[PDB]
């Protein structure tokens, strides 16, 4: 469907030295943030009225407790083993865990961890899978973790039982926001491109939601497959910005248009027309 299909929590833990570590965390629907983690309190910040989904306050409180205990205990245990794993401070650990709804209805779950910006481990079904980039440290880590009683069982429940019903309940609870349609603005600009007698045309597209969007430079019905898309960049208000560029010979820019397709436009494409062969006459 239209809006996000995945729920996931992310962790960033920075270890400055043997006694000081800081952890940031948050919860997301695709790239939409719906939870913050407040290290002031060890509780979750609900960013939308519907951010608890269909979960009761009791179950939310239990999950907050599990996360609060995990975050405090993770850093402790890492510090304790930092020598055994030949770790040099400072270092930084990342993790992401959640589940995603696919076409056809299956919900796939995942957990991945990184050290130093490189893959370190993943989980497949309460099994810790060391990543090859993590080397022997990751092999040693996965052999250690399976000995902490009950932690793989907690992970398995959260990944495979708790997350899928959370995801469904929160996508339903949030639908007024998550399935809204916001129409983009579009405008044109131009610039010199690197190379003789060349010229860069830019089609800007801004303020659309949901994220899938189609934008191409055109000559009539002919899609200009030399079109190059930038990154899709966020705005604050759950929309995005995107530019599509075309390198064109000076004197060949006439006849070009930019065409935008988006689910919000109900079939009425945006068409901006470039006028003049060069810069702007």
């Amino acid at each position: 469907f239209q809006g996000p299909t995945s729920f996931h929590v992310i962790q960033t833990s920075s270890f400055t030295n043997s006694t000081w570590a800081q952890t940031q965390g948050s919860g997301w629907l695709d790239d939409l943030q719906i939870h913050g983690w407040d290290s002031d309190s060890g509780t979750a910040i609900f960013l939308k009225p519907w951010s608890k989904g269909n979960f009761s306050d009791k179950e939310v409180a239990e999950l907050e407790e599990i996360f609060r205990v995990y975050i405090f205990g993770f850093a402790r245990e890492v510090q304790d083993f930092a020598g055994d794993f030949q770790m040099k401070y400072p270092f930084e650990i990342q993790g992401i865990a959640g589940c995603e709804l696919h076409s056809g209805g299956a919900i796939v779950s995942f957990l991945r961890g990184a050290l130093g910006g490189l893959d370190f481990l993943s989980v497949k079904n309460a099994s810790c899978v060391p990543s090859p980039e993590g080397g022997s440290r990751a092999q040693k880590f996965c052999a250690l973790i399976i000995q902490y009683q009950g932690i793989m069982e907690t992970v398995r429940i959260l990944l495979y039982e708790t997350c899928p019903r959370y995801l469904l309940g929160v996508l339903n609870a949030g639908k007024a926001d998550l399935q809204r349609q916001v129409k983009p603005e579009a405008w044109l600009s131009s610039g010199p491109s690197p190379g003789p007698g060349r010229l860069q045309l830019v089609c800007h597209v801004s303020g659309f939601y949901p994220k899938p969007v189609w934008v191409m430079w055109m000559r009539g019905e002919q899609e200009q497959q030399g079109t190059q898309l930038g990154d899709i960049l966020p705005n604050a208000n759950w929309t995005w910005y995107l530019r599509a560029t075309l390198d064109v010979a000076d004197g060949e820019a006439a006849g070009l248009s930019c065409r935008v397709k988006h689910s919000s436009l109900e079939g009425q494409d945006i068409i901006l027309y470039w006028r003049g062969s060069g810069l702007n006459d």
Binding site: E92, G117, L233, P234
Partner: peptide, 23 residues
């Protein structure tokens, strides 16, 4: 956020990406 019109209020975004470490 919006195309730049002189005098018209707007939003200025800075997107900082692709870096490591997080500091």
């Amino acid at each position: 956020r919006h195309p730049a019109e002189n005098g018209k209020s707007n939003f200025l975004n800075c997107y900082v990406s692709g870096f490591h470490p997080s500091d």
